[PDB]
Amino acid sequence: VPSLTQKKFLCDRTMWRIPFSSNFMSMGALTDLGQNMLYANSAHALDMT
Amino acid sequence: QQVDPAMLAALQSQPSGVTPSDDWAAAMDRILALTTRNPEAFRQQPQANRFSAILEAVVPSRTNPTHEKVLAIVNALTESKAIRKDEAGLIYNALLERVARYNSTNVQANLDRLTTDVREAVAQRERFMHDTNLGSQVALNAFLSTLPANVPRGQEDYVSFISALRLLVAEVPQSEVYQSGPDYFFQTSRQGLQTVNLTQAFKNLQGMWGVRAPVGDRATISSLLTPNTRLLLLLIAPFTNSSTISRDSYLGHLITLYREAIGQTQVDEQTFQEITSVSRALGQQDTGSLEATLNFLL
16 A cells, blocks of 8 residues: 655653753853853843743 | 034934024025135026025014923933933923923023033043042041051051052943941942952951061961952052062061062063964864963963
8 A cells, every 4th residue: 555654753751951051061060151251140041931 | 432522413403404583694604605615506506495594584574492402402411311211201302392481581591501610610520430439439438447557566557558459440441449337448440340348358457567577488368368358468469569568577578479470461462462473374163272381381
């Protein structure tokens, strides 16, 4: 019979994570954009979706 | 932005074009064709706007300045914030009812006396913007009539510190002191930070003017000084020459060293102006144009 594909994935036991560093690479406890002069003197609300 | 309020009264109630009803000497100046710029400009107007000016100039009209003299008062009251700006359309709606109710020869000449001292005797308002005894001299001369003049150690440098503090609130038009609660304060600027608790500073400095401390003691005054007293001595530092408290009092370890700390930043800001302008002269990451810059200067 003719047929169309349908692919998903499956992940369990763990959760996604998005690191705050610039290249999204974990190079320490603090991050690159973390110890910036920005975000450590100023405040920033965020408006996720 | 303006200096005088009656000029704005002469800008909101006078005709912009020259009329012989109010400015005859300029309206007759152009009828006889005697003017530097554009002399021949009145013959070539027709019989409409000749006779509507040439009749009214050789016999003027007789208008009423009652509606104009009050705007030289109502403006002069709202310049000095006596009335809200949302409100001057009511008081001119009430003063014009007033001076037309009780009108006389006198009141028309009594308003005219009052549109002169809001011009040349309002120079006090020009005066105490400079001498600032709004809240800096006569509000601090109550403070100097509050402190005790009998200090046991250091009788002479006590009355030279406050002699240099009265000069601080005098050479600065923005700074002012005031009575809020049972204690006096002192802010270095309106819309300003760095409020010193002036009562809780001279009470900390009382019993402190004579110490003769050595030069190997730094971290003791956490239980002896107070950081606002440490900030009041920062605000007295640029107006304190080297002859006030000479060398060897502990304030000589403080006031002289605070001038050196100000003396660092008043030439390192010029260094900081150079570094932030050569990051775009060669090409540098502007995120990393301030992290290593401040660490070299702190």
